[PDB]
Design a protein around this motif. Structure first.
Motif, PDB file in Angstrom:
ATOM      1  N   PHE A  37       0.846  -1.184   0.000  1.00 37.87           N
ATOM      2  CA  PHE A  37       0.000   0.000   0.000  1.00 37.87           C
ATOM      3  C   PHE A  37       0.888   1.244   0.000  1.00 37.87           C
ATOM      4  O   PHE A  37       2.101   1.169   0.211  1.00 37.87           O
ATOM      5  CB  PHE A  37      -0.943  -0.014   1.202  1.00 37.87           C
ATOM      6  N   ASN A  38       0.291   2.408  -0.252  1.00 34.93           N
ATOM      7  CA  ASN A  38       1.105   3.589  -0.519  1.00 34.93           C
ATOM      8  C   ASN A  38       1.109   4.609   0.616  1.00 34.93           C
ATOM      9  O   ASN A  38       1.544   5.742   0.403  1.00 34.93           O
ATOM     10  CB  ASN A  38       0.685   4.244  -1.837  1.00 34.93           C
ATOM     11  N   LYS A  39       0.684   4.235   1.822  1.00 34.50           N
ATOM     12  CA  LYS A  39       0.816   5.136   2.959  1.00 34.50           C
ATOM     13  C   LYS A  39       0.690   4.340   4.249  1.00 34.50           C
ATOM     14  O   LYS A  39       0.078   3.270   4.286  1.00 34.50           O
ATOM     15  CB  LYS A  39      -0.221   6.265   2.921  1.00 34.50           C
ATOM     16  N   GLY A  40       1.288   4.883   5.312  1.00 31.73           N
ATOM     17  CA  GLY A  40       1.255   4.269   6.620  1.00 31.73           C
ATOM     18  C   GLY A  40       0.165   4.853   7.514  1.00 31.73           C
ATOM     19  O   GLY A  40      -0.423   5.895   7.235  1.00 31.73           O
ATOM     20  N   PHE A  41      -0.099   4.144   8.608  1.00 30.87           N
ATOM     21  CA  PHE A  41      -1.157   4.502   9.547  1.00 30.87           C
ATOM     22  C   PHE A  41      -0.546   4.716  10.926  1.00 30.87           C
ATOM     23  O   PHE A  41       0.120   3.820  11.455  1.00 30.87           O
ATOM     24  CB  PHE A  41      -2.232   3.414   9.589  1.00 30.87           C
ATOM     25  N   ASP A  42      -0.786   5.893  11.506  1.00 31.62           N
ATOM     26  CA  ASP A  42      -0.216   6.274  12.795  1.00 31.62           C
ATOM     27  C   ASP A  42      -1.142   5.894  13.945  1.00 31.62           C
ATOM     28  O   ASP A  42      -2.358   6.102  13.880  1.00 31.62           O
ATOM     29  CB  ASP A  42       0.047   7.781  12.850  1.00 31.62           C
ATOM     30  N   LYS A  43      -0.553   5.351  15.006  1.00 27.75           N
ATOM     31  CA  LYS A  43      -1.249   5.088  16.254  1.00 27.75           C
ATOM     32  C   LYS A  43      -0.419   5.617  17.412  1.00 27.75           C
ATOM     33  O   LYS A  43       0.805   5.740  17.314  1.00 27.75           O
ATOM     34  CB  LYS A  43      -1.502   3.588  16.476  1.00 27.75           C
ATOM     35  N   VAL A  44      -1.095   5.926  18.518  1.00 25.68           N
ATOM     36  CA  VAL A  44      -0.429   6.227  19.780  1.00 25.68           C
ATOM     37  C   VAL A  44      -1.055   5.357  20.864  1.00 25.68           C
ATOM     38  O   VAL A  44      -2.285   5.299  20.990  1.00 25.68           O
ATOM     39  CB  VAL A  44      -0.510   7.723  20.148  1.00 25.68           C
ATOM     40  N   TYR A  45      -0.205   4.663  21.617  1.00 23.50           N
ATOM     41  CA  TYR A  45      -0.597   3.809  22.733  1.00 23.50           C
ATOM     42  C   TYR A  45      -0.217   4.510  24.030  1.00 23.50           C
ATOM     43  O   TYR A  45       0.953   4.848  24.231  1.00 23.50           O
ATOM     44  CB  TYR A  45       0.114   2.453  22.671  1.00 23.50           C
ATOM     45  N   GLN A  98       0.702   7.906  35.659  1.00 25.96           N
ATOM     46  CA  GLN A  98       1.861   7.792  34.781  1.00 25.96           C
ATOM     47  C   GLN A  98       1.511   7.076  33.480  1.00 25.96           C
ATOM     48  O   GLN A  98       1.118   5.910  33.483  1.00 25.96           O
ATOM     49  CB  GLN A  98       3.004   7.063  35.492  1.00 25.96           C
ATOM     50  N   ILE A  99       1.660   7.793  32.368  1.00 23.05           N
ATOM     51  CA  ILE A  99       1.413   7.261  31.034  1.00 23.05           C
ATOM     52  C   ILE A  99       2.749   7.109  30.319  1.00 23.05           C
ATOM     53  O   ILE A  99       3.644   7.951  30.465  1.00 23.05           O
ATOM     54  CB  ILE A  99       0.458   8.170  30.236  1.00 23.05           C
ATOM     55  N   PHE A 100       2.885   6.026  29.551  1.00 18.15           N
ATOM     56  CA  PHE A 100       4.100   5.731  28.791  1.00 18.15           C
ATOM     57  C   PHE A 100       3.713   5.558  27.329  1.00 18.15           C
ATOM     58  O   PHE A 100       3.394   4.447  26.886  1.00 18.15           O
ATOM     59  CB  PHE A 100       4.803   4.489  29.332  1.00 18.15           C
ATOM     60  N   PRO A 101       3.717   6.638  26.551  1.00 17.82           N
ATOM     61  CA  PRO A 101       3.221   6.558  25.171  1.00 17.82           C
ATOM     62  C   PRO A 101       4.190   5.849  24.239  1.00 17.82           C
ATOM     63  O   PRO A 101       5.413   5.990  24.342  1.00 17.82           O
ATOM     64  CB  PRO A 101       3.052   8.030  24.767  1.00 17.82           C
ATOM     65  N   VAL A 102       3.621   5.083  23.313  1.00 16.67           N
ATOM     66  CA  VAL A 102       4.358   4.468  22.213  1.00 16.67           C
ATOM     67  C   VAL A 102       3.741   4.962  20.914  1.00 16.67           C
ATOM     68  O   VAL A 102       2.524   4.846  20.715  1.00 16.67           O
ATOM     69  CB  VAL A 102       4.327   2.930  22.286  1.00 16.67           C
ATOM     70  N   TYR A 103       4.573   5.526  20.042  1.00 17.43           N
ATOM     71  CA  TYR A 103       4.133   6.044  18.751  1.00 17.43           C
ATOM     72  C   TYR A 103       4.487   5.030  17.670  1.00 17.43           C
ATOM     73  O   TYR A 103       5.655   4.650  17.531  1.00 17.43           O
ATOM     74  CB  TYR A 103       4.786   7.396  18.465  1.00 17.43           C
ATOM     75  N   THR A 104       3.490   4.585  16.909  1.00 17.23           N
ATOM     76  CA  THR A 104       3.736   3.592  15.875  1.00 17.23           C
ATOM     77  C   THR A 104       3.177   4.054  14.536  1.00 17.23           C
ATOM     78  O   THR A 104       2.233   4.847  14.461  1.00 17.23           O
ATOM     79  CB  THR A 104       3.139   2.220  16.233  1.00 17.23           C
ATOM     80  N   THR A 105       3.787   3.529  13.476  1.00 20.24           N
ATOM     81  CA  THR A 105       3.349   3.729  12.101  1.00 20.24           C
ATOM     82  C   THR A 105       3.395   2.376  11.423  1.00 20.24           C
ATOM     83  O   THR A 105       4.434   1.711  11.450  1.00 20.24           O
ATOM     84  CB  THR A 105       4.253   4.721  11.357  1.00 20.24           C
ATOM     85  N   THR A 106       2.280   1.966  10.824  1.00 23.07           N
ATOM     86  CA  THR A 106       2.157   0.643  10.227  1.00 23.07           C
ATOM     87  C   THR A 106       1.953   0.761   8.725  1.00 23.07           C
ATOM     88  O   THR A 106       1.107   1.536   8.265  1.00 23.07           O
ATOM     89  CB  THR A 106       0.997  -0.126  10.857  1.00 23.07           C
ATOM     90  N   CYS A 107       2.728  -0.007   7.968  1.00 18.69           N
ATOM     91  CA  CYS A 107       2.541  -0.174   6.535  1.00 18.69           C
ATOM     92  C   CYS A 107       2.022  -1.577   6.259  1.00 18.69           C
ATOM     93  O   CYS A 107       2.218  -2.503   7.051  1.00 18.69           O
ATOM     94  CB  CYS A 107       3.852   0.071   5.775  1.00 18.69           C
ATOM     95  N   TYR A 108       1.350  -1.731   5.121  1.00 22.27           N
ATOM     96  CA  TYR A 108       0.682  -2.976   4.775  1.00 22.27           C
ATOM     97  C   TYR A 108       1.170  -3.480   3.426  1.00 22.27           C
ATOM     98  O   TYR A 108       1.420  -2.692   2.508  1.00 22.27           O
ATOM     99  CB  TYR A 108      -0.846  -2.801   4.739  1.00 22.27           C
ATOM    100  N   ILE A 109       1.299  -4.799   3.321  1.00 20.33           N
ATOM    101  CA  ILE A 109       1.632  -5.476   2.074  1.00 20.33           C
ATOM    102  C   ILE A 109       0.586  -6.556   1.841  1.00 20.33           C
ATOM    103  O   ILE A 109       0.387  -7.424   2.700  1.00 20.33           O
ATOM    104  CB  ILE A 109       3.041  -6.091   2.111  1.00 20.33           C
ATOM    105  N   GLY A 110      -0.079  -6.505   0.690  1.00 22.70           N
ATOM    106  CA  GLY A 110      -1.012  -7.550   0.310  1.00 22.70           C
ATOM    107  C   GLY A 110      -0.270  -8.677  -0.392  1.00 22.70           C
ATOM    108  O   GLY A 110       0.575  -8.439  -1.252  1.00 22.70           O
TER     109      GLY A 110
END
Length: 513
Positions: free
Chosen positions: A399-407, A444-456
Motif C-alpha cells: 500500500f502507498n501510505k502508513g497509519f499512525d497510532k499512539v498507545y 503515569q502514562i508511557f506513550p508508544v508512537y507507531t506507524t504501520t505499513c501494509y503489504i497484500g
C-alpha cells in the motif's frame, strides 16, 4: 514531429471527442480538484514576497562581504518553482516546490545561517523547519498558510539576474554537488513543458491521470510506484504521439499504449544528451543497475536519470494490471457507455487480499518516530523483492501510505511489549505524528508512537515461511546510522483480512462483509 517517433494520429478532435473533453473537465471539477482563484492569487503573492526576500538576502550577504552598494544591488538572486505547481497541475492546499538561486559569493552556509533567520522574523512565516541533512537540503515552512519546500543552489557566476533561465548545461560547471542536484527539478519541469505539443491539453490529461493514480493508490515513489515526475513524463510521451488531440483522447489512449509498451524500453521525451560534467548518465549498456530498471522513465534534462528506480516485479505487475483495467473503462467512456467518474473509482486494497503483512515502526518519542518510520518505509521495496522469491508468494503488493497510532501504556514494561510487537489488547488512538510534533513546536502514562505499513500477499496457485525475509528486513532497518536501540523498534506480523484494524477503512467505508 514531436518526440522521438512518428505520431499515432494527427487528426483534429472530432465533435464527440470535444464533448467528452468537456465532460472530462466537468468530472475533474466534480472532484473539486481546482483551487479557488483567491488561493491562486495568494500563491502568486507569496512567491512575489519570496522573490523580494531572496534579493534582500543576497544583498545582505554581499554587503557583509564588503561589496559596494552598486555591486550589491547587481548581485540579484532569483526564485524558481518546479514540480506540480510549475506544471500547473496541483490541488487545493498543495505544497509549492521552490528553489532559490544565488551568485557564487552566497553559500549553502548563508542559506541556513542567514536566510533562515530572515524567514523566522517574518510574521507571515509559520512552521519553519530547516533540514540541512536531507538528500536535497531544504527549508520547510508556511507563508500566509501556503506550504513552501525551499531548496537552494549556488551558481558559479557573479550575478543572478531576474530573467535568468536554467536551461544551459554549462550553468552546471563549477557548481557544488548538492547544488547540481537542487537544480535538476526545475530543469526537468521546464523541459517537460517544452517537449509537449500543447501545454493546455497536457495539463488537463495529467490532472486526470494523476488523480486516477492516487485514487488507485499507485502514486508513491518510495514503495515503487511512479511519483509525480514519472507520471508527468508518461503523460507527456502520449501527448507527443497525439499532437493535435484533446485531453479526453490523451487519457483514453494513455492506458493501453503503456500496458502494451515493450518494457523495459525506456520512456524518453527526447534523445539522451551528453554534457560538460563527469557524471553518470542513465545507460543500461554501461551500468548494470540501469539495465535492471523495469519500467524506466528517463528525465530529459542533462544528466538524464531514471525516475522509477524503485519499481519491483510486484509493483510493475500492479501498475500494468491497473492500466489494463483503466483502458477497458476508458473504452466504454469514449462510446458514452460509462461516465468519467467510473475511471476514478477508488482502490479496494483492504478488501481484495486474504493475507496481509503488517510492518510496524515504533518509537518512544514522536520526533524519533517521524524519522524512524520514514526509514522503515524506505526499505519496504527490499522486503517486497525478497518476498517475491519465497516460493509460495507470487506477488507482494505494498500500500502507498502508513497509519499512525499512539498507545498510552500504563507501565514501562507494557510500552516495551507494545513497541516490540507484543501488542495484545493494549488500547490505542489513531493519530498523526507529524501534526503532533509540529503542534508541540508551535506550543503515569508511557506513550508508544507507531506507524504501520501494509503489504497484500498474492499466493501461488496451489502456514507461510517468511523467517529469512523478516530477519533480513530487521537487520537492514537496524543498520540505519540513526537507529537508536533505546528508542526505536520494528516488527512484522501476518494479518488475515478479517483481522485488519478499523484504521484502514476510511470514515463511512463499510468493512468487507
Amino acid at each position: 514531429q514531436w518526440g522521438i517517433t512518428p505520431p499515432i494520429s494527427t487528426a483534429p478532435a472530432t465533435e464527440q471527442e470535444n464533448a467528452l473533453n468537456t465532460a472530462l473537465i466537468n468530472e475533474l471539477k466534480n472532484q473539486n480538484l481546482f483551487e479557488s482563484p483567491a488561493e491562486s492569487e495568494k500563491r502568486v503573492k507569496v512567491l512575489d514576497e519570496l522573490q523580494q526576500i531572496t534579493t534582500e538576502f543576497v544583498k545582505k550577504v554581499s554587503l557583509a562581504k564588503h561589496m559596494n552598494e552598486k555591486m550589491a544591488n547587481e548581485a540579484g538572486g532569483k526564485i524558481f518553482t518546479y514540480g506540480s505547481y510549475r506544471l500547473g497541475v496541483y490541488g487545493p492546499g498543495s505544497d509549492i516546490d521552490t528553489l532559490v538561486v544565488v551568485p557564487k559569493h552566497v553559500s549553502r552556509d548563508n542559506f541556513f545561517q542567514d536566510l533562515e533567520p530572515m524567514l523566522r522574523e517574518r510574521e507571515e512565516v509559520t512552521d519553519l523547519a530547516a533540514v540541512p541533512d536531507a538528500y536535497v537540503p531544504i527549508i520547510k515552512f508556511k507563508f500566509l498558510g501556503i506550504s513552501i519546500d525551499l531548496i537552494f543552489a549556488r551558481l558559479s557566476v557573479p550575478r543572478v539576474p531576474r530573467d535568468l533561465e536554467l536551461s544551459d548545461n554549462n550553468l552546471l560547471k563549477g557548481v557544488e554537488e548538492r547544488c547540481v542536484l537542487s537544480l535538476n527539478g526545475t530543469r526537468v519541469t521546464d523541459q517537460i513543458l517544452q517537449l509537449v505539443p500543447n501545454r493546455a491539453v497536457f495539463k488537463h490529461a495529467l490532472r486526470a491521470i494523476k488523480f486516477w493514480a492516487q485514487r488507485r493508490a499507485i502514486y508513491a515513489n518510495v514503495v515503487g510506484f511512479p511519483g509525480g515526475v514519472a507520471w508527468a513524463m508518461m503523460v507527456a510521451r502520449i501527448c507527443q504521439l497525439y499532437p493535435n488531440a484533446v485531453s479526453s483522447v490523451i487519457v483514453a489512449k494513455f492506458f493501453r499504449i503503456l500496458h502494451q509498451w515493450n518494457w523495459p524500453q525506456p520512456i524518453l521525451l527526447k534523445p539522451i544528451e551528453d554534457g560538460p560534467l563527469q557524471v553518470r548518465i542513465w545507460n543500461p549498456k554501461l551500468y548494470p543497475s540501469d539495465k535492471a530498471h523495469r519500467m524506466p522513465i528517463i528525465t530529459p534534462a542533462y544528466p538524464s536519470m531514471c525516475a522509477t528506480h524503485n519499481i519491483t516485479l510486484s509493483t510493475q505487475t500492479i501498475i500494468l494490471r491497473e492500466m489494463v483495467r483503466a483502458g477497458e473503462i476508458a473504452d466504454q467512456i469514449m462510446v458514452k457507455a460509462l461516465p468519467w467518474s467510473a475511471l476514478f473509482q477508488k482502490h479496494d486494497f483492504f478488501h481484495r487480499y486474504k493475507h496481509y503483512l503488517t510492518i510496524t515502526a515504533a518509537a518512544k518519542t514522536a520526533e524519533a518516530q517521524l524519522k524512524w518510520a520514514g526509514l522503515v518505509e524506505s526499505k519496504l521495496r527490499h522486503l517486497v523483492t525478497r518476498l517475491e522469491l519465497v516460493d509460495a508468494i507470487a506477488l507482494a503488493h505494498p500500500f502507498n501510505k502508513g497509519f499512525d497510532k499512539v498507545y498510552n501504556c500504563s507501565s514501562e514494561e507494557e510500552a516495551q511489549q507494545v513497541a516490540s510487537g507484543v501488542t495484545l489488547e493494549v488500547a490505542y488512538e489513531s493519530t498523526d505524528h507529524e501534526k503532533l510534533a509540529n503542534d508541540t513546536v508551535n506550543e503515569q502514562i508511557f506513550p508508544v508512537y507507531t506507524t504501520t505499513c501494509y503489504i497484500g500477499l498474492e499466493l501461488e496457485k496451489k502456514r507461510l515461511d517468511i523467517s529469512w525475509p523478516t530477519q533480513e528486513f530487521y537487520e537492514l532497518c537496524k543498520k540505519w546510522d540513526k537507529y537508536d536501540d533505546t528508542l526505536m523498534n520494528v516488527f512484522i506480523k501476518n494479518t488475515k483480512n478479517t483481522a485488519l484494524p478499523d484504521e484502514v477503512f476510511e470514515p463511512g467505508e463499510e468493512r468487507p462483509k
